Symmetry: D2
Subunit: 333 residues, 4 copies
Amino acid sequence: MLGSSSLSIRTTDDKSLFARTMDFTMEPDSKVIIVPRNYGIRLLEKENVVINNSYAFVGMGSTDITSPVLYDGVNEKGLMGAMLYYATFATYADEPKKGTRGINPVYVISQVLGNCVTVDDVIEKLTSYTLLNEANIILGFAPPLHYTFTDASGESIVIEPDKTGITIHRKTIGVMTNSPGYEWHQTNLRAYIGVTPNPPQDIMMGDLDLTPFGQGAGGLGLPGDFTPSARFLRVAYWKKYTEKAKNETEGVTNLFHILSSVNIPKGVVLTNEGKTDYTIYTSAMCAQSKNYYFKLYDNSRISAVSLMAENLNSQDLITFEWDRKQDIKQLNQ
Amino acid sequence: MLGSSSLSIRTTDDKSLFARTMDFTMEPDSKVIIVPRNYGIRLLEKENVVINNSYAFVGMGSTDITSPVLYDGVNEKGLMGAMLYYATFATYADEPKKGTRGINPVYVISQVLGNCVTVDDVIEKLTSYTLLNEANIILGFAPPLHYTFTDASGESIVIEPDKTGITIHRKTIGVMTNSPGYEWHQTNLRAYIGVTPNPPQDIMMGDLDLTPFGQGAGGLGLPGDFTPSARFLRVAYWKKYTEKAKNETEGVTNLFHILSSVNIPKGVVLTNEGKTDYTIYTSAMCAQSKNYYFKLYDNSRISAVSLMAENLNSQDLITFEWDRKQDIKQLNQV
Amino acid sequence: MLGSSSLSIRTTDDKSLFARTMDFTMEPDSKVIIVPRNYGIRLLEKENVVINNSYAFVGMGSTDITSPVLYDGVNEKGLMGAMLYYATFATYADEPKKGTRGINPVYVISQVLGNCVTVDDVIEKLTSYTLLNEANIILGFAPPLHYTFTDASGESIVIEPDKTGITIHRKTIGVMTNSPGYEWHQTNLRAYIGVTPNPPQDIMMGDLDLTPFGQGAGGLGLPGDFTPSARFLRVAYWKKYTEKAKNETEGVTNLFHILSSVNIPKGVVLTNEGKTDYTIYTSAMCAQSKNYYFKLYDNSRISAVSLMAENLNSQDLITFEWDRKQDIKQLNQV
Amino acid sequence: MLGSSSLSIRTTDDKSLFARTMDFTMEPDSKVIIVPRNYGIRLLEKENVVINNSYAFVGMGSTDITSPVLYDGVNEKGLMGAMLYYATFATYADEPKKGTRGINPVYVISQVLGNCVTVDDVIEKLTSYTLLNEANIILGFAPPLHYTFTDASGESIVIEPDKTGITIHRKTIGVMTNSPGYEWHQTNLRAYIGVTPNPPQDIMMGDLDLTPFGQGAGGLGLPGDFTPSARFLRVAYWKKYTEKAKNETEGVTNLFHILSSVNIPKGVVLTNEGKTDYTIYTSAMCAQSKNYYFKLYDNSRISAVSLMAENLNSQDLITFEWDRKQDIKQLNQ
């Protein structure tokens, strides 16, 4: 994990959808995963302590350690959520606070999705855990994360494990990328309210008449780079000005169009080490249907996994593998 | 038409691909159109003169007037091309210059793809015509246009009907959006050479340590808006830096990722007249395969049409309709 | 007041200097004021408590209300400070927290310059005060303010009356404009670390060589408008790269070159109400010499006042009136 | 030279004024020079044809080579001009075109100010010349230049020795910096018409109010760096919107304020060669008064030279040296 952009939206259909890109430096073995009720998810990768999960859920994630790790997903009661990179800000403890258990940052999404309904449930659950510096997701240090959640009702929150403790932001705008903290970007929005769909008025310099080249000059000032702050502003503004989605499909379509302003093609961003950082997949999920939708760097065709289609009291993890090949429809031979 | 961005690329296995977005306010009757050889293409809509085309070609276009109007396409000899808005700059004439025939701007692609092989053929071809200020029932007036072509060998040209006459640009960088002129954008590139994939180095102010938020800071300065100038910069720069495609399928994919930085969602851009200006479709062509690929605002799955698959001596236009339904694959019952 | 930019610097001379532009819609009655020892400063306009001041100071201010109101200044012990706008963020009590005295935001600088020596004294003094929502008759309301101070040693702090109470920021980078809060701008700096004095290297796009138009391209990404946030970046970044000053005089000069990046011409910024927001004056002060220097919108020649040349036990304010006529040295008859 | 910004303005007092910064790496020997009538100006350093100047002028320049080289200046008939850097564009001949006299690029201002009145006079003058690729000794080589002139009527033209020959632009907006060519910057202007003094309206995102930080948001998008294109934008836009000067003195004041957005502190721009590039002097001249005004990097106090005060039929050049000392006025000691 190395960067990502997310947002949620509300349809006129009365549905809530959430979506996110994921950026990274290669493809990992990642599938969409359906975790059945009562499966058991650890808190710490170093202790064999299991929490029985009341709920089933589906999302993108890894099976590379003991309990499924979910980057995002939706559960059978309509809770949607994700974890996103939060570098230089994320701060964790060595020891739990008296009265809490240790949890690995990498397990937050799975635990919550499996045991919560509303955004208030999330806030409540969280006060019974301390995020811990557990080394060895055999992928190293606990990655610097922060979290967003959105429930069936359309409310979004952000949880950020800062130096000064856990920060909750309630009733947010339903946008989140990477560092810095949420209130920093919310404040940043203010510097860019002049970014609109509407063209500016022609002007004169002496005798000279000045008019735009074409269209789209309203957005002058919007940065087009892929830093977390730039991405934050493109998702928010294009969330603001994109037409309301009138049903679930349109919602998926509109989410992927907005995220398209923050999709990273392979080669245009390199890391301090010269690894390439690119959008591996984009996904979306609907609280009311509990459908998971996703598309990949190598596959523009959207796939869909339906949570309630499966037997939720299954003993076993149900799994779908990525199809990393451009799914082109041939209209003739 | 109302805006669009385009580029070409080269693969590792020596294939040339060209791609474009089409931005518009309505989205009208448009389809893929295969024009066969010897179909006959009008020069002017108010006149009965028809040039008989030597080559078959496929591209997106309209069948609403006498001859197919192609917005872009590839022909059987591997020439690719496209017309794109050129507002404020496109200048035409009332009457043909001595020794040329008039041509309607919306017929250029069709005429060229129908009769040329190399970009040099295109340049020579063009000195026997004069763009005329005609007009069409569709939009109600001659649209301000400029044109781009790329042949099998990956060489690109831009043709621009300027106030002073027709301006040719030879061996271009293979990127073109809208106004202004090609020389203006080529010159503009230089103000932006500091936009790279590489992070800037940490610095200090007094006792502060300052380091980037995440990744991507090497891009500081690139603009994010949907003006033609900004779109050019984004397509040019991201063309430079994203990976070389290893084959044809990767070409289409990469082209669409790059164009993605200039895809316009419904509502983010409005005209003076309050109309929403958004990307209706996105297409890519391949000189060697002569395949035509496309996706739409409501359908992200790519479709393909093979020109060489059809009877190239057909009497009748062959067409493929837009499938404006988001084509979701269900991996279980949805 | 309606905007302003400020910074401090240290010479290789072991001197500290502070300087600020002042941006406002019209020029009230302002001059440079020397407040002598034991003069007396009110805390509040509606209450009659007058706090006796231990120290003399000089700076820019108004004499329109009961006690001299200073916008910035330096005192006889080398404490330097200023009040600047903090719109939408400043928050005041109706009523003092138990066991503090109420203080009008507009008296904070005069109270502090009068009774403090170090950065720590300022912090301590402030916990004995509570900022109240008391209006004044120059403006009609309590203007939203924040404050910066710099002592003889060169430490700088920012003090910000936030919703949740007074926020203190210790040993800052020595720059401060307007809203938002200090942490936010400090964080904002990280997004621009790639803004440097050095040019980026040429690149090629295919056959094309791309080189800068001239000099200065290292700064690509720096915004040029006059919002508080853009002014912070320019002053901070140009404070970083500007040559160290070798003595007091060069320190004044450097301060005003840097501040020139954020000097606002009449007409270029207008308020929601159409009043023009422009840089009325620019000042500087040195902690070691206790000299105050200023120039005006209408007069770029620098004037200087020396606190310690006066009698610090004078009965009365000593004041120097602005000279609003461009002070042009005639080199021959004009 | 390695940069200059320049503009002209018109007061409501019916006076025309012209101003320019000059940016360089170290200050060579320059002063204000008054060139009297009939003093004579060389065309080329390597040939002794001297052209007799009808008119007296005053400008900043150098006395290091045979004839005075002025960098800018105004003449006794109200014609004002400057030569600015034109790197990578300026093209000069090896040989004078059939029926022209060769001229050293560095002598254009001096020759033009010495014999022209209107911008038309200057267009006709220059087409009797060919700019020649002849080296000079204060800088070592032939510097790539272009030229701006403004006559007493307030019309401006820009002359640029392009690849394809001398390009001429009639009645320009009265702004000029460095490369690229005039028509490129004029076209660039259209991209930035939404740059105004006015704040954008407040907006909302969901339940959140968004309002500007303070003032000045109207200018969002304007670049702040010191390249020539950015320098052009700022000078033009700030020239459009800063208030009309009511007289000659305000004209000067306003000119230097607009020019201050393009003033370069020592250290914020370094060349490839690690040399620091900075604003050495800022000057202004008035067509009606024939006054010349200047301030320096080290002295923001403005100085003035009046052309007509002198004997315009003097035997010798009259000059004034720079005072690179901050001229502080002591209000008490």
